[PDB]
Amino acid sequence: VNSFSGYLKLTDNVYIKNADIVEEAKKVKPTVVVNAANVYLKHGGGVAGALNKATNNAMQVESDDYIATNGPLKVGGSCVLSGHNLAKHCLHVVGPNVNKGEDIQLLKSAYENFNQHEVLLAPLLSAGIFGADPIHSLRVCVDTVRTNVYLAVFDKNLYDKLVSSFL
Ligand SMILES: CS(=O)(=O)c1c(F)cc(NC(=O)[C@H]2C[C@@H]2c2cccnc2)cc1F
Ligand SMILES: [Cl-]
């Protein structure tokens, strides 16, 4: 039993809700919140910009030190950093950005990072400003993630379409 509330159950391990991931994280304080990161951990907009804003820029400060030490992530890769006031940990995961021409096949590799964590609060990878089809992202999530994932979808219209079209 966990504290996630109001989710629709899609499969044995995948759950979904129309919610602002920032507000959801502040309420649940999950062990892991997933960020929709880029390879530079520049949290400018989308989910990343919102999460970072909610940390009062502490996420960005920590991220800049991470990059200075380690260099950029790979597309499809991840790193674990602090969750600040939102979660114990933040798993920064880089899905392919279609608006940069990146291989959509890397979306499966990106979701594989979730399997290293027993329970996660997450957005749909490569959705939103990353330019991929969110219906496809949900399909890859369900077919790749085996651990317990709670998906927050900000847009109510999109949430209803994802549920109604789910096979
Ligand atoms: C007062 S706060 O600082 O805690 C704070 C905050 F800075 C930002 C947000 N959410 C936002 O910006 C959503 C539009 C951002 C979004 C979410 C999910 C996917 N794509 C975009 C909520 C907060 F509660
Ligand atoms: Cl977004």
List the domain boundaries for the chain: 8-163
Strand partners, 14: 149
Strand partners, 32: 89
Q: What's the CA gap between 37 and 74, in Å, rounded?
A: 11
Residues 94 and 103 sit within 8 Å (Cβ to Cβ): no
CA of 153 to the centre of ligand 1 (A): 12
> In this structure, which ligand is nearest to the CA of 55?
1
Q: What's the CA gap between 106 and 58, in Å, rounded?
A: 29
Give the burial class of 3: count Cβ atoms within 10 A of its Cβ; 0-12 exposed, 13-18 middle, 19 or more buried: exposed
CA of 129 to the centre of ligand 2 (A): 5
Q: Say which CATH superfamily domain 8-163 falls into.
A: Leucine Aminopeptidase, subunit E, domain 1 (3.40.220.10)
| PDB resolution in Å | 1.0
For 114, half-sphere exposure in the C-beta direction (CA atoms, 13 angstrom radius) is 31
Give every strand in the sheet of 32-36, ordered side by side: 8-9, 14-18, 148-153, 119-122, 32-36, 89-93, 78-82
Give the residue, out of 16, 17, 18, 20, with the most ligand 1 atoms within 8 A of its beta carbon, to mutate for a pocket test: 20
Assess whether the C-beta atom of 81 lies below 6 angstroms from ligand 1.
no
What are the phi and psi torsion angles at 89 (to 5°)?
A: -130, 150
Assess whether the C-beta atom of 48 lies below 6 angstroms from ligand 1.
no
State the DSSP string of the chain: --S--SPEE-SSSEEEEE--HHHHHHHH--SEEEEE--TT----SHHHHHHHHHTTTHHHHHHHHHHHHH-PPPTT-EEEEE-TTT-SEEEEE----GGGT--TTHHHHHHHGGGGSSEEEEPPTT-GGG---HHHHHHHHHHH--SEEEEEES-HHHHHHHHHT--
Strand partners, 36: 93
CA of 105 to the centre of ligand 2 (A): 20
Structure tokens at 157: 């219209």
Q: What's the CA gap between 104 and 95, in Å, rounded?
A: 8
CA of 49 to the centre of ligand 2 (A): 9
Distance from the first to the final alpha carbon of the chain = 26
Please state the separation of Cα 75 from the chain's center in Å.
Answer: 14
Question: Residue 68: CB partners within 8 Å, gap ≥ 6?
Answer: none
Q: What's the CA gap between 70 and 86, in Å, rounded?
A: 24
